Write a protein that binds this ligand. Structure first.
Ligand SMILES: CCCCCCCCCCCCOC[C@H]1O[C@H](O[C@H]2O[C@H](CO)[C@@H](O)[C@H](O)[C@H]2O)[C@H](O)[C@@H](O)[C@@H]1O
Ligand SMILES: CCCCCCCCCCCCOC[C@H]1O[C@H](O[C@H]2O[C@H](CO)[C@@H](O)[C@H](O)[C@H]2O)[C@H](O)[C@@H](O)[C@@H]1O
Ligand SMILES: CCCCCCCCCCCCOC[C@H]1O[C@H](O[C@H]2O[C@H](CO)[C@@H](O)[C@H](O)[C@H]2O)[C@H](O)[C@@H](O)[C@@H]1O
Ligand SMILES: Cc1c(C(=O)NN2CCCCC2)nn(-c2ccc(Cl)cc2Cl)c1-c1ccc(Cl)cc1
Ligand SMILES: NC(=O)CN(CC(=O)O)CC(=O)O
Ligand SMILES: NC(=O)CN(CC(=O)O)CC(=O)O
Length: 873
């Protein structure tokens, strides 16, 4: 979990050109493929595919024919205050309808209404005119055998349909609504493009203050959107992908991808500032923030995968879109972006107590409970704003022609014997149905209840299956009534499925509450276990768990307060109503994933700040201080993009956009600035509790002068051993062993162990220090600098002796005055740099940054061994 990133940090620099070359190609390549996604999405996926109501629907459609009476209904109004019985007006509007049908029989079944045969004596067909005879409504059924294909047929037809009767015609019903709701997806996209993008740019340019560093996270976000669209278009080949998946790509793209790059470009900028070369800088960015971004991605994946337990194809498409977008953004941010930073380098900056935890926990259990007012429902026309025209057409359809809009509950019966269902068997099942109270009798007659479902040409008309249906008299009674009709023991040899839109809707709701317990368990445990792996603590996952658990109930609290009870509904032009039931599942996961993502970008920095070597109090203030500006900048970029989506006409889109605004504002202030810094010193030293090598001068000179466990001849021809330790200049090898035996204290016959070399090396060091402390030109600088920077100066004394490095009077002076950059530049102009660059560049870098990094990740190995000065004996 800590060396692969060092592995990848090195190689993304070596092959930086092909890396930026291939994945930009594929993302753009995915972009051209993915643009077609909108023509391969579905509106279906809100019900439970394994439910008995879905079985009841499936069987009922197959046998009786899909119900198409609610597809399109159109209200007609004669102009100039003529009345619909005007035979001239009648003649002109029907021949217009007849012409629309003949032009579009591949999409229109036909049109039916009182306007056909206006001399009829039918009570219901005469109920298609109003009493003042100034409005009449026709029903216009259409071709197709899934929702999607039928909607694409309505949109071909309605331009030519809206113009009948000189435009004085209002279109309502299933397909007009579905068209308006699915049409909000496209409008919310263009509002993101227009408002969020420039706003995001401004926030970036304020966080970085320079064009190049600001433009990079924007280009990453663009590439992730292009790549994720290509992936989801590919997923479309194999399984239906809901409409709602496309806005999810845009969100994560403009939001998380851009925020991922903000964290990385910011970390590259700091490492440049601390004196690291750019290829050093790229490696340590990947090893820290790249690891943080990667583990952020897997956390979010760990939070969205649990939604795959729910059956709705709607939640599955969304889950796939989160997964694809999020890690494409992680992968993009440590490939395309890192390679870019490796190419440019510094030119990214080229252009222009209990006193606060208590009165806050009080107000967040304050908000958790407005829940319990939470109610759930299906799609109605109320998902649109009240001034929306087609919603108004529906609401006046149901005012002028009441009683045609129905949601009958269905008892689909089938006998797998295969032979017909006799009249006594349905009279049987009918009798069992009148058992249950709560159903409608416009006839005051039980004998006229539970009529057969109507049947049309699309139906197979198999005799071994019959459907009877009857509307409900109060739909809030539906869940229990449905359970009651299923409790009926069927006749002998028949299976009875309970159908109807209230059965589909209710069965969907029952599946969520049935799998919601386990979903909550998987989610919080895997996120918990994950954070234990990211830090090594066992309380910092548990501190994050109950904070996240609390910002969840509070945000759900406000949302119910706003969308069930309506506080803000008049302001923001939405109707208060029960929530789309699978929206609760989606909202829970994404908000949980957001709360725990905040607790990694802040705490993983102070986990880093403390493992370096510090106590608590400061580690948290370092962590909070260095991340303070970045997390707000990241917070505002999310808040900007989400703020565009709160103005969506579709009320489930507003619900979700608001959930994130309330959630990311609550954590970017109340939690991050106040509550957990409080609890982070409150329980202050066991933050890092869990039940389950430092570099040094030995290891650095081992790299620069080698480590040899048996006598060898150096470049000059002299017998050497260990770390550059000269034994003798005698040609006799026996004289070298005689001296090696003397130095170690035993018969070596030319070989020592590692610890023996270490004991020999230390003696050489001690002699080098004694010399340094006895030179007027080296001792003052030597005293000036720290343990690491002293090792670099001892290295020089080893390679060239005291007189040698004492000749660097300027650079030693600059080092004494802590002017590291000036000394690094001056020393690199020496002759010692050009003769032994790999070691001089390595040593100078240690003066610049004051750490071992040039030695912990070094190039190749050395091939020319040379005994150092200050060989002790
Ligand atoms: C981006 C957000 C978009 C918002 C969503 C738009 C709301 C419009 C809802 C229109 C649905 C048409 O409802 C009318 C139909 O419903 C059921 O069939 C539907 O339910 C079955 C089991 O699910 C499927 O197998 C059928 O294919 C499927 O047509 C009935 O069995 C049909 O007799 C009836 O014709
Ligand atoms: C969420 C949005 C919800 C939208 C709500 C909108 C609901 C609208 C329901 C419309 C019900 C229309 O009613 C349909 C009627 O017309 C048909 O009969 C006709 O059949 C022959 C056609 O050639 C002719 O002989 C005669 O015109 C006639 O008898 C059917 O047999 C019956 O079904 C019913 O009588
Ligand atoms: C700081 C950021 C730097 C770079 C950010 C730029 C990202 C661009 C915003 C989103 C990417 C381009 O659009 C992505 C979306 O559009 C596609 O095509 C459609 O685009 C319009 C839809 O309203 C119509 O004009 C067309 O009918 C139709 O083909 C897809 O159908 C959608 O699935 C997809 O979501
Ligand atoms: C899980 C998450 C996060 C998150 O943890 N972000 N982390 C990133 C690193 C820094 C700390 C915050 N953000 N967003 C997000 C994305 C776009 C916008 Cl417009 C607003 C937001 Cl809230 C979402 C998210 C994911 C899926 C959906 Cl369907 C909706 C929202
Ligand atoms: N790096 C050094 O200090 C060597 N100096 C020589 C000196 O200061 O005596 C060369 C210079 O003036 O830059
Ligand atoms: N062959 C080597 O690696 C010797 N080194 C010099 C040394 O290690 O003393 C060459 C260099 O660093 O440029």
């Amino acid at each position: 979990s800590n060396a692969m990133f060092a592995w990848w940090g090195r190689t993304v620099y070596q092959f930086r050109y092909i890396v930026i070359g291939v994945m930009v190609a594929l993302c753009l390549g995915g972009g051209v493929y993915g643009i077609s996604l909108g023509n391969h999405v579905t509106q279906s996926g809100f019900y439970d595919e394994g439910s008995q109501s879905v079985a009841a629907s499936l069987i009922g459609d197959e046998v009786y024919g899909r119900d198409r009476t609610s597809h399109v209904v159109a209200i007609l109004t004669p102009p100039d205050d003529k009345k619909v019985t005007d035979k001239a007006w009648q003649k002109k509007v029907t021949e217009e309808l007849d012409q629309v049908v003949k032009d579009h029989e591949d999409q229109i079944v036909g049109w039916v209404g009182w306007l056909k045969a206006p001399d009829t004596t039918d009570p219901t067909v005469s109920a298609m005119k109003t009493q003042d005879l100034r409005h009449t409504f026709i029903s216009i059924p259409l071709q197709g055998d899934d929702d999607d294909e039928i909607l694409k047929n309505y949109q071909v037809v309605e331009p030519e349909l809206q113009q009948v009767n000189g435009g004085d015609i209002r279109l309502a019903g299933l397909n007009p609504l579905a068209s308006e709701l699915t049409g909000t997806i496209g409008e919310d996209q263009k509002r993101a493009e227009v408002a969020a993008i420039p706003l995001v740019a401004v926030v970036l340019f304020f966080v970085f203050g320079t064009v190049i560093a600001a433009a990079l996270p924007a280009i990453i976000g663009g590439l992730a959107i292009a790549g994720a669209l290509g992936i989801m278009r590919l997923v479309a080949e194999f399984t239906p992908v809901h409409f709602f998946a496309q806005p999810v790509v845009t969100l994560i793209g403009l939001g998380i991808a851009i925020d991922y790059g903000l964290f990385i470009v910011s970390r590259f900028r700091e490492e440049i500032a601390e004196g690291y070369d750019t290829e050093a800088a790229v490696r340590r960015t990947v090893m820290t923030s790249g690891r943080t971004v990667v583990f952020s991605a897997v956390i979010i994946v760990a939070s969205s995968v649990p939604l795959l337990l729910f059956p709705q194809g709607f939640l599955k498409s969304i889950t796939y879109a989160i997964i694809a977008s999020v890690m494409l953004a992680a992968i993009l941010s440590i490939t395309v972006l890192a390679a870019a930073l490796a190419i440019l380098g510094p030119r990214v900056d080229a252009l222009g107590p209990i006193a606060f935890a208590a009165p806050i926990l009080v107000v967040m259990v304050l908000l958790i409970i407005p829940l319990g007012q939470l109610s759930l429902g299906g799609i109605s026309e109320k998902y649109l704003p009240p001034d929306n025209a087609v919603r108004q057409s529906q609401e006046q359809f149901d005012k002028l022609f009441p009683g045609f809009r129905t949601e009958p509950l269905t008892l689909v019966m089938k006998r797998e014997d295969g032979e017909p269902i006799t009249d006594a068997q349905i009279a049987d099942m009918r009798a069992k149905a009148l058992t249950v109270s709560g159903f409608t009798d416009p006839d005051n007659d039980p004998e006229k209840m539970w009529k057969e479902r109507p049947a049309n040409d699309s139906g197979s008309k198999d005799p071994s299956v019959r459907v009877i249906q009857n509307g409900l008299e109060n739909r809030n009674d539906a869940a229990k009534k449905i359970d009651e009709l299923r409790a009926l023991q069927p006749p002998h040899g028949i299976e009875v499925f309970v159908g109807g839109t209230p059965a589909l809707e209710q069965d969907s709701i029952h599946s969520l509450f049935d799998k919601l317990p386990l979903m909550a368990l998987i989610l919080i445990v895997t996120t918990t276990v994950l954070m234990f792996l990211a830090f090594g603590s066992v309380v910092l996952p548990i501190k994050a768990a109950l904070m996240s658990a609390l910002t969840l109930g509070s945000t759900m609290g406000i949302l119910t307060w706003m969308f069930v009870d309506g506080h803000g509904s008049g302001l923001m032009n939405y109707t208060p109503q029960p929530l789309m039931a699978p929206m609760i599942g989606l909202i829970i996961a994404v908000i949980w994933g957001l709360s725990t993502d905040y607790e990694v970008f802040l705490v993983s920095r102070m986990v880093e700040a403390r493992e370096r070597g510090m106590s608590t109090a400061e580690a948290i203030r370092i962590g909070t201080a260095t991340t303070g500006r970045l997390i707000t900048g990241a917070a505002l970029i999310l808040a900007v993009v989400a703020g565009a989506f709160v103005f969506s006409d579709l009320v489930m889109m507003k619900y979700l956009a608001f959930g994130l605004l309330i959630a990311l504002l609550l954590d970017a202030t109340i939690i991050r600035m106040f509550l957990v810094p409080a609890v982070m010193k409150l329980l202050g030293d066991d933050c890092w509790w869990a039940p389950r090598k430092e570099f040094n001068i030995f290891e650095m000179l081992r790299i620069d002068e080698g480590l040899r466990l048996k006598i060898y001849k150096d470049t000059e021809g002299y017998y050497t051993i260990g770390i550059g330790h000269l034994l003798t200049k005698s040609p006799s090898l026996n004289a070298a062993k005689s001296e090696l035996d003397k130095a170690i204290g035993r018969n070596t016959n030319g070989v020592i162990t590692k610890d023996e070399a270490e004991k020999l090396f230390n003696q050489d060091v001690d002699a080098a220090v004694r010399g340094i402390l006895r030179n007027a030109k080296l001792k003052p600088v030597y005293d000036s600098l720290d343990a690491v920077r002293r090792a670099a100066l001892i290295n020089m004394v080893f390679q060239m002796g005291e007189t040698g490095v004492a000749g660097f009077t300027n650079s030693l002076r600059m080092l004494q005055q802590k002017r590291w950059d000036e000394a690094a530049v001056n020393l690199a102009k020496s002759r010692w740099y050009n003769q032994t660059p790999n070691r001089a560049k390595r040593v100078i870098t240690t003066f610049r940054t004051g750490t071992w990094d040039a030695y912990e990740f070094h190039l190749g190995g050395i091939k020319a061994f040379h005994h150092h000065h200050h060989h002790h004996h």
